[PDB]
Design a protein around this ligand. Structure first.
Ligand SMILES: CCCCCCCCCCCCCCCCCC(=O)OC[C@H](COP(=O)([O-])OCC(O)COP(=O)([O-])OC[C@@H](COC(=O)CCCCCCCCCCCCCCCCC)OC(=O)CCCCCCCCCCCCCCCCC)OC(=O)CCCCCCCCCCCCCCCCC
Ligand SMILES: CCCCCCCCCCCCCCCCCC(=O)OC[C@H](COP(=O)([O-])OCC[N+](C)(C)C)OC(=O)CCCCCCCCCCCCCCCCC
Ligand SMILES: CCCCCCCCCCCCCCCCCC(=O)OC[C@H](COP(=O)(O)OCCN)OC(=O)CCCCCCCCCCCCCCCCC
Ligand SMILES: CCCCCCCCCCCCCCCCCC(=O)OC[C@H](COP(=O)(O)OCCN)OC(=O)CCCCCCCCCCCCCCCCC
Ligand SMILES: CCCCCCCCCCCCCCCCCC(=O)OC[C@H](COP(=O)(O)OCCN)OC(=O)CCCCCCCCCCCCCCCCC
Ligand SMILES: CCCCCCCCCCCCO[C@@H]1O[C@H](CO)[C@@H](O[C@H]2O[C@H](CO)[C@@H](O)[C@H](O)[C@H]2O)[C@H](O)[C@H]1O
Lengths: 62, 171, 97, 459, 113, 604, 170
C-alpha cells in the first residue's frame, strides 16, 4: 500500500505499520539483530526514527 | 502462526512468571502457583473450540489487568540488565585473517588448526550448495528450516557461522 | 555490451603485510610514509608550534600593558583622571550651529 | 606574497617532472615545506596590517585562512592518492595540478587589496573546483552537482561584479586600504537596497545562507574526498571572508537589511541541525552540519561587534579543520564498504579501535567541547548575539542541544552497537589514514593553547 | 477490566487483538505466503553470507531503495516562522533602542559587545 | 603561602601524571590500575596539608598562574580558588575515589579494557577538580562539560548494548538542556558586569540578579537531576557499578548544588530565587523518594536515593543555608558511595543479579557487606551521630524554623520519612528472609581489595561527619532555640517511616494476592514521566524536519531550479522550432520594420 | 618585580603565633620540612641560573611612539594624515583596554584580600573601577566591529552636542 498521492514525494514506496523496532520479536534470528531486520525486507520509511535507540511504540501497562 | 495449544502454554508460562514477581517469597509463590494451575486444569478438556477460544481471550484480558508493571527479567534476557553486555567483546573470526604475521607467530598451533577449519569449509561448500539446490521445491523454500547432512563425510548445509560463532563470554 | 567487467577491489595488505597504505611499491610506500611524518610532524607541527609560542609580542599585546602601566603611574602621581570620556581634545573640535 | 605564489606554482613542474611513482611523495613533501613557511605571515602588528605591495596584503583575518589553505593541500594529496591508484599517470598529474591551481587562486584571493582582483580570483576558484567534482566524482549525479554549484554561484557573483564596478566609479577606488578611509555612509533608498543585496548575496550563497544551501549537500555527496575537504575547509569561507570585508562600506544600511538574513540563519541553524538527526547519507549529514555552523558565522558577521567578529574568525578556522576531518573519517569507511549510508556498517569500534578514537575526537570538536577553538568561536558568537537581543539565547541554546545529539548519534550509529555480520572486508587502518586524521586534530587542539592567532583583526 | 486504548506511541498488545484469535483459512494462506517470501529472501542472503570465497558487502536492494527514496525531494519550513521570529526580535530591539536613547536602560559596566 | 600554594597544585598535577604516562607510552601496563590507585592515595595525602593550613587559620588564596587570553577588557587566566569549599571537598573526593578505585580493581578484574576504565575514572575525577577549583566561569565551564562527557563515556561503557548507548545519550541530552542556563548566566555576567571572574562578580554584587540566577538554577537542575530534568540519573545505572558509585557521590551529580553554593553571595540577597530552588528541591526530594518505594533493581533504588538526597541539598540552598548544603555534599559522599559498593558486592556474588526479589538470606552469608549496608542505611536515614546526622539533622531544623514555603517544608519531612522506607526495603529484601537466588551458591566477599575499600568508607561513614563538623569554622548563626516538636521532627518521622516500612514489608509474607493500585503503578513507572516524555518529545522532534501554506507556494514554485529550467527550455523551443521557409522569415522582417516605425518611432 | 604604585598592596599584618595547647602544630614541622627539602634545593638551582645570566647581560627597551596629529586635524579624504592619525588612535585604544584591565585587577585583588569585609574595605577600588569603565564606555562603546577614529569622533561630537543642548536648556 503506497502513501496517499500528494506533494510529499513518497512515490510508490510502501506504507508500513508505524511500529518501533523494539516491538519485534527479540528471540527470532534476524539478519541484523541490533536493528531486528532481515536482509531484503522493506524498511519502514521512518526506520531511522524507530530504531531501538529512539522512539518506542510498545504497549504499556497503563 | 501460533496454534491454540501454543497460545495457551505461552500464557501459562507468562502468568506464572508475573505471579512469581508479585509473590516474591517462595512459599507464597508455590501456594498461588498451584491455584493458577488448578484454573488451567479446570478447562483442560474443553472440546468446544469456540468456548475454548473465549476462555483464552478472557484469560488474556485478565492477565493484562493483573500483570506486574515491573516483572522480573533474567539478567541476560531481552530487556534484562546484562542483555547484550558482552557484544562489544565479540569479534568475528574473519578478523584473524588480517593479523600481521608477527601476531600470528605468537599462536602457531592455534593458526595451524585454524587452517584445517578453513580447508574443511572450502571443501564442503560445493556439496552444501548442491544439496540445498536438489532439496528445494521449484518456487524456492517455503520455510527457514535447513536440512541435515545426508551422507557420511558431509556437513550440514550452512554450518560455518553457527559453528564458529563467538563465545558467549569471549574475553 | 563491449564493456570490461568491474575489477575486484585490491587489499594492499595481501601483497605487503607491512604496507603503510601509501603505495603498492614497498620502497615508495615507506618513503611516502617518512616525508609525511617528518615534514608533517617533526617539522611543521613541532617547529611551527615552537615558532608560534615565541612570536615577538603578537599585535603588541605586551607593549600595551607596559604602556598602560606607565600612563597609570604617571596620571595617578599627578592627580589626573585615569581615563577621560573625550578621546579628542574639544579645543580642536568645532560643533555646528 | 610572491614568496608563496611562486613556490606554489613550482609545485606544477615538480609534479610533471617527477618520476612516475614519486608524484605523491614529491608533491606532498614540498607542499608541506610551503605550509611551513606560511607561518612567517604571523608578523602581525596591533595597528597596521602587513601590507606587502600595491597588490597583496595580509592582516589577522587573512593570515589564519592562508595557513589553513596551505596546510590543506598536503592533506588533500594524502586523502586522494588511494582512490586514484588505478588512474593513468597523466590524469593523476592533472588532478594534482587542479589542486595546486586551486591553492594558487585561494592564497591570492585572501590577500588581494583591490576588490575586483578579489572578485576575479574568487571567481577563478570555480573552474578547478567544478572540474574536480565533475571529472573525478564517482556517480552519475556529479554532472548535475557541478551545474548547481556553478549557477548558484554565478547567479550571485554577476550582480556583485556590477556593484563593485559601480562602487569604484563613485568612490574612485576599490583598494581595501583606501576604502577604510574614504568610506561614506549608505543612505536609505531603493538604489542602495539593491546595491546592498548585490554586494552580499554572492557571499551568502557561498556560506551558504539557509534557503540558498541546497547546492551544498548535492556537491558533497558527489565530490571526491579532496573536493569535499577544500569545499568544506576553505571554499565556504570565501563567503565569510568576503562578507567580513565588504560590510565596511555598507553601513549603516546593514542595521535593518540584516534582519531577514539573521532570521533565516537563526531559524535555519535549528532546522538544519534537526535535519541532521534524520539524514541517512553520512556525507549528506556532514554537509548539513556545515550549514548549521555557518549560520552562526553569518549572524556574527551581520551584527558587527568586536566579539562577534572574533567569534566568526575562530569558528571559520575551527569548522574548516573539523568538517574536513569528518569527511576524511567518512571517506575511510567508504573506501572499505563503498557506500555512504550511515546505517550500513555499524559497531566499527570493535573492528577499528584507534579509528574510533578519531571519530570521538572529531565529534567532540563538532559539538564544541570546551576549551576547543570550536567552542571559543561559538561561545563568542553566543555572547555577542545575547547583547544584540537576549531572546537569541534560547535559539542558541536549543541548537547546542541538537548539535550534541546528532554529533553523538553519528558516532553511536557507526562506531557502537553490533557490527554488521555480512561485512567482512574491514581491514585494519592504514598508517596513511591514521596520519591523515591526526594532521587534522592535532593542529586543531594545539590552537587551544594559543587562541589569539585565530581571533582575527578585532583581537 | 477497562478496555485497552491504543495510541500512536502505545500500540495494542497482540494478545488483546481480536484479529489474533479469529484466524480464517485465507488468513492462514496469507501467513503461509508471507513466510514463503521471508524464506526465499533468507536463502538468497545465506547463500552469499556463507560463501567462503566472498569478501565484501552483500548489497541489499531494500537498503538501497530506502536511502534512494529518503534522499529524493530536495509550519516550520516556509516564511511563517521567519516572520514570527522577525516580529519577536524587531519588537524586542525596538524597545531596547528606545530605552537606551531615553537613558533608561542600565549599561553601567557594559563595555564588552 | 609557598607551601600552601605549591601543595595545592601538586595535588592536581599529580592526578594528571598517570594520564601523561599512558598517552606517551612510558608506564607498566601490568598494573596500571594499581598505579592510578596509588596516585589518588598520594594526592589525598598532599591535599590534606593545605586543608590543615586552612582549618588552622582560615588561610585562603587564589592562584592566577597563567595568562591564557585577553579579549579587549576581559582577561582570562588559568585561576584556581583554594577556599573553604575547595579545601574541604578535595580531600573528601580523593578519599572516596581512593576506595572506589581499589574496589574497581576487584570488581572490574575480568574486563579486558580495565586499563582504559581506570583512565576514564581518573579523567572523570580531574574534570571535577577543575570544576571545584575554578575561579572564573570559563574555566568552570571546562570542568562542567568535562564531567558530562566523561559520564557519557562511562555510562556507555558496554557500548554493544543499545540500552547503554541510549542511557549515555540521555545523560548528555538532559545535561546540555541545563547548559542553556549556564551559558545564559555567562552571557549576562559578561554583558552586565564585564567579567567571568567570581571576585568581580561578588564585588559588583548586582541587585537585578534574577536572570543570571535563574540560569544557574537551570544549570544545577540538569547537573543535579532535579524535577523536570531528573530521569537521566536513574537511567545512568547502565554503567558499571564503580561508575555509579563515583558518579553519585563525588563527581557529576553534586556539581549542580556546588554551582549554587559558589554563588551564594548573590542568591542570599534574592528571595525570589530562594523560593524557586526551595520548591524545586522539595518536589524533587519527595517525588524521587516516592519512586524508590517500589523499585526492585538495587541500583535504581540507590539511584533514586541520590536524587532524593540532591533535592534535600537544593532545599538547603532554598532556605539560605549554603554551608549546610555543602556539608551534606561532604557527608553524603561517604555512605552513598559505600552503599553502591555494597550493592556491587551482592551483585557480583549473585552472578550479575540486580533484582532484590531474587536476593534474600544474605545477612549471614555476606557478613561484612551486611555490616556496611546497615551502617550506610543508618547514616543515610540520619541515625544520631553517624556521618549523615551531622548534616541532615541540622538541615531539618534549619528548614523547620525558617520563614519558608509551608508546602515545601511538609514535602521535605515526608521525603525524610520515605527515606526510612526504601532504606528498610533494601535491607529487608536483600539481607533478611530465606534465599531466593539460584541453587549454585558462589557467594564470596573475601577479597582484600573489596574488604579494604569498603572498610575505609565504613570508617568514614561513622566519623567523618563528626570530624568535619568540629573543624570547619562557623559562618552562620546556627538556630538552636525551638520547641521540642521542631527539634525532634526528623528523628520521629524517620522512626515512623521505619515502623511503617516493617508493617508493609512483613505483609508481603501473608498468603494474600493483591491487585495493583493506581498509586502503586504511578510509583513503579516513575510517574510516567519517562514513558510519556521519552516517547512524545523524541517523536515530535524527529518528525519535525523529515516532513500547507499557499503564500510559500508562490515563491517556491516561482524560483525552483525545476521552474527556471522549464521556462528556458520552453523559450528555447519557441525560438528554435521554425519551418525553415524563406517566405516566413522575410514576412517577419516586414512586421519588424513596420512596428519599428509605427509603435517605437525608430525612424525618428 | 613590579611597580607597587600601579599595583598597590596594603602593609601585611600577620598575627604572631599564640598557642593555647600542648600538642605540636603539624603545620610548623611541615613548614620546616618544606623549607629544607623543597625550597632550599630549589633556591640553589635558581642561584646557579642567576649566575649564568649575570655573565651575559643585555637589554631590551619599551618602544616610545611620538605623538602625531589626530583625526580632528586631518583634512577630509587626506589618506596620508588619516593613516597616521588612525594608527595612533588604534594604539591608544589598545592602551585604554589595558588600563581598564589594570583597574579590574585591582578590584579583584582587593575583594579576595579583604575577605568577608570586602564590601566596606574595597570602596575606593570599586569607585575607581566605576569611573574608568564610564570613561571607557564613552570613548569606544557602540562603535561596531569596523570602528575607526572617524566614528569615535562622530560619537564624541554627538555627545558634546547633547551636553551643550542640556546646559543650554538649564
Ligand atoms: C611540540 C608540539 C607537540 C605536538 C603535539 C604533542 C602531543 C601529541 C602526542 C601524540 C602521541 C600520543 C601517543 O602516542 O599516545 C597514544 C595514546 C595511547 O595509546 P593506547 O594506549 O594504545 O590507546 C589507544 C586508544 O587510542 C586510546 O583511546 P582512549 O579511548 O583510551 O581515550 C583516548 C582519549 C584521547 O586522548 C585525549 O584526548 O580520548 C578520551 O579519553 C576522551 C576524553 C575527552 C576529554 C574530556 C575532558 C575535557 C576537559 C579537558 C581539560 C583540559 C585541561 C584544562 O592513544 C591516543 O590517545 C591517540 C590519540 C592521541 C590524541 C592526543 C591529543
Ligand atoms: C602546556 C604546554 C606549554 C605551552 O603552553 O606551550 C607554550 C605555548 C602557549 O603558552 P604561551 O602563549 O604563554 O607561550 C609560552 C612562551 N613564552 C613564555 C615565551 C610566551 O604553546 C603554544 O603557543 C602552542 C601554539 C600551537 C599553535 C600552532 C600549531 C601549529 C600550526 C601548524 C599550522 C598547520 C595547521 C593549520 C592551522 C590553521 C590556521 C591557524
Ligand atoms: C524545572 C524545569 C524543568 C524543565 C523541563 C524541560 C525539559 C523536559 C523535556 C526534556 C526532553 C524530553 C525528551 C528526552 C528524550 C530522552 O531522554 O531520550 C531517551 C529516549 C528513549 O530513552 P528511554 O525512555 O530511557 O528508553 C530506554 C530503553 N529503550 O531516546 C531518544 O529517542 C532520544 C534520542 C533522539 C533525540 C530526539 C530529540 C529529543 C528532542 C527533545 C529534547 C529537547 C530538544 C531541545 C529543546 C529543549 C530546550 C527547550
Ligand atoms: C580560563 C583559563 C582556561 C585555560 C584553557 C586552556 C587549557 C590548556 C591546557 C592547560 C595546560 C596547563 C597550562 C598551565 C601550565 C603553565 C603553562 C606555562 O607555563 O605557560 C608559559 C608561561 C607563560 O607566562 P604568562 O605571562 O602567564 O602567559 C603568557 C601569555 N600567554 O611562562 C612562564 O610563566 C615561565 C615558565 C617557566 C618554567 C620554569 C620551570 C620549568 C621546569 C621544567 C618543567 C619540565
Ligand atoms: C526591433 C523591434 C522588434 C520587437 C519585436 C521583437 C520580437 C521579434 C521576434 C523574434 C523571435 C522569433 C521566435 C518566436 O517568436 O517564436 C515563434 C512564436 C510562435 O509561437 P506561438 O506558440 O504561436 O506563440 C506563443 C507566444 N507566447 O512567435 C512569438 O511568440 C512572437
Ligand atoms: C538566477 C539566474 C539563473 C540562470 C540559470 C542559467 C540558465 C540555465 C538554462 C537551463 C535550461 C534548460 O535545462 C533543461 O531543463 C529541463 C528540465 O525540464 C531538462 O529536461 C529534463 O527534465 C524534463 C522535465 O523536467 C524532461 O521532460 C526531460 O526529458 C529531461 O531531459 C534538461 O535536461 C535541461 O537541459
Amino acid at each position: 500500500e503506497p502513501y496517499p498521492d500528494d506533494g510529499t514525494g513518497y512515490g510508490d514506496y510502501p506504507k508500513l505499520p508505524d511500529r518501533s523496532q523494539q516491538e519485534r520479536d527479540p528471540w527470532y534470528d534476524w539478519d541484523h539483530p541490533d536493528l531486528r531486520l532481515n536482509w531484503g525486507e522493506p524498511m519502514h520509511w521512518d526506520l531511522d526514527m524507530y530504531i531501538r535507540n529512539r522512539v518506542d511504540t510498545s504497549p504499556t501497562p497503563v | 502462526y501460533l496454534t491454540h495449544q501454543q497460545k495457551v502454554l505461552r500464557l501459562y508460562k507468562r502468568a506464572l512468571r508475573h505471579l512469581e514477581s508479585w509473590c516474591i517469597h517462595r512459599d507464597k509463590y508455590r501456594y498461588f502457583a498451584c491455584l493458577l494451575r488448578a484454573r488451567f486444569d479446570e478447562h483442560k478438556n474443553e472440546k468446544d473450540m469456540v468456548k475454548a477460544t473465549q476462555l483464552l481471550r478472557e484469560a488474556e484480558e485478565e492477565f493484562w489487568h493483573g500483570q506486574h508493571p515491573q516483572p522480573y527479567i533474567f539478567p541476560e534476557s531481552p530487556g534484562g540488565t546484562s542483555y547484550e553486555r558482552y557484544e562489544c567483546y565479540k569479534v568475528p573470526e574473519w578478523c584473524l585473517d588480517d593479523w600481521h604475521p608477527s601476531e600470528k607467530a605468537m599462536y602457531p598451533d592455534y593458526f595451524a588448526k585454524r587452517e584445517q577449519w578453513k580447508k574443511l569449509r572450502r571443501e564442503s561448500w560445493e556439496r552444501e550448495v548442491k544439496q540445498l539446490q536438489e532439496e528445494t521445491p521449484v518456487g524456492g523454500p517455503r520455510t527457514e528450516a535447513l536440512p541435515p547432512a545426508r551422507k557420511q563425510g558431509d556437513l550440514p548445509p550452512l554450518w560455518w557461522h553457527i559453528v564458529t560463532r563467538p563465545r558467549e563470554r569471549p574475553m | 555490451w563491449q564493456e570490461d567487467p568491474e575489477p575486484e577491489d585490491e587489499n594492499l595488505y595481501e601483497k605487503n603485510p607491512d604496507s603503510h597504505g601509501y603505495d603498492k611499491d614497498p620502497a615508495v610506500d615507506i618513503w611516502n610514509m617518512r616525508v609525511v611524518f617528518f615534514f608533517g610532524f617533526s617539522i611543521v607541527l613541532v617547529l611551527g608550534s615552537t615558532f608560534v609560542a615565541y612570536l615577538p609580542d603578537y599585535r603588541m599585546q605586551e607593549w600595551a600593558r607596559r604602556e598602560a602601566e606607565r600612563l597609570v603611574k604617571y596620571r595617578e602621581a599627578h592627580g589626573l583622571p585615569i581615563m577621560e570620556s573625550n578621546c579628542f581634545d574639544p579645543s580642536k573640535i568645532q560643533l555646528p550651529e | 606574497m610572491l614568496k608563496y605564489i611562486i613556490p606554489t606554482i613550482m609545485l606544477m613542474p615538480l609534479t610533471w617532472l617527477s618520476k612516475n611513482n614519486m608524484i605523491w611523495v614529491n608533491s606532498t613533501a614540498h607542499s608541506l615545506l610551503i605550509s611551513f613557511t606560511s607561518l612567517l605571515l604571523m608578523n602581525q602588528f596591533g595597528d597596521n596590517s602587513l601590507n606587502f605591495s600595491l597588490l597583496f596584503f595580509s592582516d589577522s583575518l587573512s593570515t589564519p585562512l592562508l595557513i589553513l589553505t596551505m596546510w590543506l593541500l598536503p592533506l588533500m594529496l594524502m586523502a586522494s592518492q588511494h582512490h586514484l591508484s588505478k588512474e593513468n599517470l597523466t590524469r593523476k598529474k592533472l588532478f594534482i595540478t587542479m589542486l595546486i591551481s586551486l591553492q594558487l587562486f585561494l592564497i591570492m584571493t585572501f590577500t588581494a587589496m583591490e576588490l575586483i582582483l578579489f572578485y576575479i580570483l574568487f571567481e577563478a576558484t570555480l573552474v578547478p573546483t567544478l572540474i574536480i567534482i565533475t571529472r573525478w566524482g564517482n556517480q552519475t549525479e556529479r554532472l548535475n552537482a557541478g551545474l548547481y554549484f556553478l549557477f548558484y554561484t554565478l547567479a550571485g557573483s554577476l550582480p556583485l561584479l556590477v556593484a563593485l564596478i559601480y562602487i569604484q566609479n563613485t568612490v574612485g577606488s576599490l583598494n581595501f586600504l583606501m576604502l577604510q578611509y574614504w568610506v561614506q555612509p549608505v543612505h536609505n533608498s531603493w538604489s542602495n537596497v539593491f546595491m546592498w543585496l548585490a554586494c552580499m548575496m554572492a557571499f551568502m550563497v557561498k556560506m551558504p545562507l539557509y534557503g540558498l544551501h541546497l547546492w551544498l549537500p548535492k556537491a558533497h555527496v558527489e565530490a571526491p574526498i579532496a573536493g569535499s575537504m577544500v569545499l568544506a575547509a576553505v571554499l565556504l569561507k570565501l563567503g565569510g571572508y568576503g562578507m567580513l570585508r565588504i560590510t565596511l562600506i555598507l553601513n549603516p544600511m546593514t542595521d535593518f537589511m540584516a534582519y531577514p538574513f539573521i532570521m533565516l540563519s537563526l531559524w535555519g541553524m535549528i532546522m538544519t541541525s534537526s535535519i541532521c538527526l534524520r539524514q541517512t547519507d553520512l556525507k549528506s549529514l556532514i554537509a548539513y552540519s556545515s550549514v548549521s555552523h555557518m549560520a552562526l558565522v553569518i549572524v556574527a558577521i551581520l551584527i558587527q561587534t568586536p566579539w562577534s567578529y572574533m567569534g566568526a574568525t575562530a569558528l571559520m578556522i575551527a569548522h574548516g579543520l573539523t568538517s574536513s576531518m569528518l569527511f576524511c573519517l567518512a571517506n575511510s569507511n567508504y573506501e572499505r564498504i563503498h557506500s555512504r549510508t550511515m546505517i550500513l556498517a555499524r559497531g566499527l569500534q570493535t573492528l577499528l579501535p584507534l579509528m574510533a578514537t578519531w571519530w570521538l575526537l572529531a565529534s567532540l570538536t563538532n559539538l564544541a567541547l570546551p576549551p576547543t577553538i570550536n567552542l571559543i568561536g561559538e561561545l563568542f558568537v553566543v555572547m555577542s548575539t545575547f547583547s544584540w537581543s537576549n531572546i537569541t539565547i534560547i535559539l542558541m541554546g536549543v541548537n547546542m542541544v541538537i548539535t550534541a545529539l546528532y554529533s553523538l548519534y553519528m558516532l553511536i550509529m557507526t562506531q557502537r552497537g553490533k557490527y554488521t555480520y555480512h561485512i567482512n572486508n574491514i581491514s585494519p587502518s592504514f598508517t596513511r589514514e591514521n596520519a591523515l586524521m591526526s594532521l587534522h586534530i592535532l593542529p586543531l587542539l594545539l590552537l587551544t593553547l594559543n587562541p589569539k592567532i585565530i581571533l582575527g583583526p578585532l583581537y | 477490566f477497562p478496555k485497552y486504548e491504543a495510541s500512536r506511541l502505545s500500540s495494542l498488545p497482540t494478545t488483546l487483538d481480536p484479529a489474533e484469535y479469529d484466524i480464517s483459512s485465507e488468513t492462514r494462506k496469507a501467513q503461509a505466503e508471507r513466510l514463503a517470501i521471508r524464506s526465499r529472501l533468507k536463502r538468497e542472503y545465506q547463500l552469499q553470507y556463507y560463501d567462503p570465497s566472498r569478501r565484501g558487502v552483500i548489497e541489499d536492494p531494500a537498503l538501497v531503495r530506502w536511502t534512494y527514496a529518503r534522499s529524493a525531494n530536495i509550519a516550520l519550513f516556509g516564511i511563517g516562522p521567519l516572520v514570527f521570529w522577525y516580529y519577536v526580535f524587531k519588537t524586542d530591539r525596538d524597545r531596547k533602542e528606545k530605552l537606551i536613547q531615553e537613558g533608561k536602560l542600565d549599561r553601567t559596566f557594559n563595555i564588552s559587545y | 603561602m609557598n607551601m600552601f600554594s605549591s601543595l595545592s597544585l601538586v595535588t592536581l598535577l599529580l592526578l594528571t601524571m598517570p594520564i601523561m604516562m599512558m598517552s606517551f607510552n612510558t608506564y607498566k601496563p601490568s598494573n596500571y590500575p594499581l598505579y592510578v590507585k596509588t596516585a589518588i592515595s598520594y594526592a589525598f595525602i598532599t591535599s590534606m596539608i593545605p586543608t590543615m593550613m586552612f582549618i588552622h587559620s582560615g588561610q585562603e588564596l587564589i592562584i592566577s598562574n597563567w595568562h591564557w587570553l585577553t579579549i579587549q577588557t576581559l582577561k582570562l587566566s588559568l585561576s584556581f580558588k583554594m577556599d573553604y569549599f575547595s579545601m574541604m571537598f578535595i580531600p573528601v573526593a580523593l578519599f572516596v575515589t581512593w576506595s572506589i578505585m581499589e574496589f574497581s580493581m576487584w570488581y572490574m578484574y575480568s574486563d579486558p579494557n580495565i586499563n582504559k576504565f581506570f583512565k576514564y575514572l581518573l579523567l572523570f575525577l580531574i574534570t571535577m577538580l577543575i570544576l571545584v577549583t575554578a575561579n572564573n566561569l570559563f574555566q568552570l565551564f571546562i570542568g562542567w562539560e568535562g564531567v558530562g562527557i566523561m559520564s557519557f563515556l562511562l555510562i556507555g561503557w558496554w557500548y554493544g548494548r543499545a540500552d547503554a548507548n541510549t542511557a549515555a545519550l540521555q545523560a548528555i541530552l538532559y545535561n546540555r538542556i541545563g547548559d542553556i542556563g549556564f551559558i545564559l548566566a555567562m552571557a549576562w555576567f559578561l554583558t552586565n558586569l564585564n567579567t567571568w571572574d567570581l571576585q568581580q562578580i561578588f564585588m559588583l554584587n548586582p541587585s537585578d540578579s534574577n536572570m543570571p540566577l535563574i540560569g544557574l538554577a537551570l544549570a544545577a537542575t540538569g547537573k543535579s537531576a532535579q524535577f523536570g530534568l531528573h530521569p537521566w540519573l536513574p537511567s545512568a545505572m547502565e554503567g558499571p557499578t564503580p561508575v555509579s558509585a563515583l558518579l553519585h557521590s563525588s563527581t557529576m551529580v553534586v556539581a549542580g548544588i556546588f554551582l549554587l553554593i559558589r554563588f551564594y553571595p548573590l542568591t542570599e540577597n534574592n528571595k525570589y530565587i530562594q523560593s524557586i530552588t526551595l520548591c524545586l528541591g522539595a518536589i524533587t526530594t519527595l517525588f524521587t523518594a516516592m519512586c524508590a518505594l517500589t523499585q526492585n533493581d538495587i541500583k535504581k533504588i540507590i539511584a533514586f536515593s541520590t536524587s532524593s538526597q540532591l533535592g534535600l541539598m537544593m532545599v538547603t540552598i532554598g532556605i539560605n543555608q549554603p554551608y549546610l548544603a555543602f556539608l551534606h555534599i561532604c557527608t553524603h559522599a561517604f555512605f552513598k558511595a559505600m552503599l553502591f559498593m555494597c550493592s556491587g558486592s551482592i551483585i557480583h556474588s549473585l552472578n550479575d543479579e540486580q533484582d532484590i526479589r531474587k536476593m534474600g538470606g544474605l545477612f549471614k552469608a555476606m557478613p561484612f557487606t551486611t555490616t556496611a549496608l546497615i551502617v550506610g542505611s543508618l547514616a543515610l536515614t540520619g541515625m544520631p551521630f553517624l556521618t549523615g546526622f551531622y548534616s541532615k539533622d541540622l538541615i531539618i531544623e534549619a528548614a523547620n524554623t525558617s520563614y519558608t514555603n509551608a508546602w515545601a517544608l511538609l514535602m521535605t519531612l515526608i521525603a525524610t520519612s520515605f527515606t526510612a522506607i526504601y532504606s528498610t526495603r533494601i535491607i529487608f529484601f536483600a539481607l533478611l528472609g530465606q534465599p531466593r537466588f539460584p541453587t549454585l551458591v558462589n557467594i564470596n566477599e573475601n577479597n582484600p581489595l573489596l574488604i579494604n575499600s569498603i572498610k575505609r568508607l565504613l570508617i568514614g561513614s561513622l566519623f567523618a561527619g563528626y570530624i568535619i563538623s568540629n573543624n570547619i569554622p562557623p559562618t552562620t548563626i546556627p538556630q538552636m532555640t525551638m520547641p521540642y516538636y521542631l527539634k525532634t521532627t526528623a528523628l520521629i518521622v524517620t522512626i515512623l517511616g521505619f515502623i511503617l516500612a516493617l508493617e508493609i514489608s512483613n505483609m508481603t509474607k501473608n498468603l494474600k494476592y493483591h491487585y495493583p493500585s493506581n498509586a502503586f503503578k504511578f510509583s513503579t513507572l516513575l510517574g510516567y514521566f519517562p514513558t510519556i516524555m521519552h516517547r512524545l518529545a523524541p517523536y515530535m522532534n524527529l518528525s519535525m524536519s523529515q516532513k500547507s501554506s499557499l503564500l510559500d507556494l508562490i515563491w517556491l514554485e516561482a524560483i525552483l531550479p525545476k521552474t527556471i529550467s522549464l521556462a528556458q527550455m520552453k523559450a528555447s523551443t519557441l525560438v528554435t522550432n521554425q519551418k525553415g521557409l524563406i517566405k516566413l522569415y522575410f514576412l517577419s522582417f516586414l512586421i519588424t520594420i513596420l512596428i519599428s516605425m509605427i509603435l517605437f518611432n525608430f525612424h525618428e | 618585580s613590579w611597580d607597587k604604585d600601579v599595583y598597590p598592596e596594603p602593609p601585611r599584618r600577620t598575627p604572631a603565633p599564640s598557642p593555647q595547647t600542648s600538642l605540636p602544630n603539624p603545620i610548623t614541622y611541615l613548614t620546616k620540612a618544606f623549607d629544607l627539602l623543597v625550597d632550599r634545593p630549589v633556591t640553589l638551582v635558581r642561584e646557579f641560573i642567576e649566575r649564568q645570566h649575570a655573565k651575559n647581560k643585555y637589554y631590551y627597551y619599551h618602544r616610545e611612539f611620538r605623538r602625531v596629529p589626530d583625526i580632528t586635524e586631518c583634512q577630509e579624504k587626506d589618506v596620508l594624515c588619516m593613516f597616521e592619525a588612525e594608527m595612533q588612535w588604534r594604539r591608544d585604544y589598545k592602551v585604554d583596554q589595558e588600563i581598564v584591565n589594570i583597574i579590574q585587577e585591582r578590584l579583584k585583588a582587593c575583594q579576595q584580600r579583604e575577605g568577608e569585609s570586602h564590601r566596606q574595605n574595597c570602596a575606593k577600588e570599586l569607585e575607581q573601577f566605576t569611573q574608568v569603565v564610564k570613561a571607557y564606555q564613552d570613548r569606544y562603546h557602540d562603535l561596531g566591529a569596523h570602528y575607526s577614529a572617524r566614528k569615535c569622533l562622530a560619537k564624541q561630537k554627538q555627545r558634546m552636542l547633547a551636553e551643550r543642548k542640556a546646559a543650554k536648556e538649564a
